Amino acid sequence: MDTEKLMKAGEIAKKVREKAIKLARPGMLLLELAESIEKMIMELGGKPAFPVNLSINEIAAHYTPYKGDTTVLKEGDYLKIDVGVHIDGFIADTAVTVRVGMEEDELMEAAKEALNAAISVARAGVEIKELGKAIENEIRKRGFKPIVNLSGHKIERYKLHAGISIPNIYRPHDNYVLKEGDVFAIEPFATIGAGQVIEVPPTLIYMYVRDVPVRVAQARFLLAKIKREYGTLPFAYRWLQNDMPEGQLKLALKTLEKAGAIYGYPVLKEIRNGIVAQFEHTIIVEKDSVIVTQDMINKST
Amino acid sequence: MDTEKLMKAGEIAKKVREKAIKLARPGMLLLELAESIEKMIMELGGKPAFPVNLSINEIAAHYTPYKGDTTVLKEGDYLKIDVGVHIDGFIADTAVTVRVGMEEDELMEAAKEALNAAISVARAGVEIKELGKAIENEIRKRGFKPIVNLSGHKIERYKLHAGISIPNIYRPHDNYVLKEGDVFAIEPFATIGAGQVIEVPPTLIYMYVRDVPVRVAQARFLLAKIKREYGTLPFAYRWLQNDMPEGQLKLALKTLEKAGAIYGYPVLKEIRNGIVAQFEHTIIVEKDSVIVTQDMINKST
Ligand SMILES: [Co+2]
Ligand SMILES: [Co+2]
Ligand SMILES: [Co+2]
Ligand SMILES: [Co+2]
Ligand SMILES: [Co+2]
Ligand SMILES: [Co+2]
Question: Which residues are registered as beta bridge partners of B152?
């Protein structure tokens, strides 16, 4: 059922996340890491909810390797491993920051404790603004800044971002009350920069939006492909690299973007190039003591 | 009818808004201005969707006069007039900034243009992120900063803040898709300060949030009155200053808050005391959105 499938996605996400952390050592090629992770997900009976994100230092999110990517992990690098798994549409979304070859530092602890404080107050009947306050307080109290344009989000079947979000700053009108059964991802983002991310090249992730008319055949068929293979879930440029020539692929995606058929999600980096840390868990809201699907499994595997 | 009542609410809000501007002259007592406005709304056949807010300079919002308030408008003051009207629950929400006894300046122009830019791209099928994008670019381009924790919001029957917001900055994940029938208030806030607001005393606005048991007789009766006359819409401390002595009223309100029956909304000011400008309109999504808070429009295509 619902809960069962969700917890199952959570269990897989957890195993996959731990393995990634163990593989995230100096010299490790990002492409190999992303591949191993997505492979483990399928062999465990699940499917990726989106391409595994591996964002380093000032890159906050939306970075997933591509065939030919020579990028490798370096000691001291602040690697954000964001993995998502779904079972029949029920999504588990989790993330961690690892400082390659080193222990967690103050900045990383800020994001992790912000997440703990948010889960501590997150329960049925509480307004979202309360989580934002708790998150903002932990980050600023420790001397860092929260990212104002990246945060948590409601999750629904086959819908990574259901609409309602969980800010990392307190907003007086976030009066939305968490209901039992609600599925939310809480993602505190802390930085030493300004506290805002900007889009920058290249675009490695895309998502299907609408079924608009496309005159260009190659683009029109790429859309029909995307629509049925990925549906409403994010996909990686990497996942399509062996389908058609790089050149043609790049132009077909661009056409779909301008046509408004799909949305491109380029790399997000801190505006002042500030190091970014992130931690995330998916939880099921319940009358007090919410369940953390990506913790130790406590609902219905 | 449905859309009929909504349009009517906007008609009244518009007339009252334009009248408030004419009355916003040097020496005008805030208490007098609010009273005149709220009185005009009722004689016009409508009811305040909330107490008329009159927020000056670094005060962004949530300020409404009270019995005994001697504050008056001073020439050169950046007064933001935010007025709301509802017809049987259908709410119209609009606002404008006026530089008392003077003409529009740089800051004000930015906020107003930001609102026009959002409305321009607002149509069924568009993701909210596109509104935030247009808003931020108009404000940033003129050298000002948009307030990151105060913005637009979805509106529903007897529900000023439905849940979904329209930020004044670009957030990559605000993927909510505007759909026909949707009612939204676009509320750009611009400042020369840091770009964030904080809650500060006093608390002049409250709002019924939950039907919780209240034993205390005096506080219990006050709650019955609230639910009876204000329902789930915001109300002013001012609207209750004639029912009982200040002391009892304060304790009564504190008791209702402690029980979690009502929620207080304290004044909001720019964190760096920077001047704040605001402009706002309520729209109803269609094949091509229509502004509720303005004179009616033809068919055309
Ligand atoms: Co994302
Ligand atoms: Co995630
Ligand atoms: Co997430
Ligand atoms: Co408000
Ligand atoms: Co308003
Ligand atoms: Co509003």
Answer: B166
Residue B295: how many other CB atoms lie within 10 Å: 9
Neighbours of A32 (CB within 10 A): 13
CA distance A229 to B28: 64
- CA of A163 relative to ligand 1 center, distance in Å: 13
Residues contacting residue A176 through CB under 8 Å, at least 6 positions apart: A127, A128, A164, B163
Q: Give the domains, in start order, of chain B with CATH numbers.
A: 1-194+272-301 (3.90.230.10), 195-271 (1.10.10.10)
Half-sphere exposure in the Cβ direction for B177 (13 Å, CA): 12
Specify the DSSP class assigned to residue B155: -
Chain centroid to Cα B87, Å, comes to 16
CA distance A17 to chain B (A): 23
Interface contact A153-B165, CB threshold 8 A: no
- Contacts of residue A36, defined as CB under 8 A and 6 or more positions apart, other chains included, come to A19, A20, A23
Q: Which residues of B266-290 are buried (b: 16+ CB within 10 A; e: fewer)?
A: bbbbbbeebbbbbbbbbbbbeeebb
Q: How far is CA B62 from the centre of its chain?
A: 8
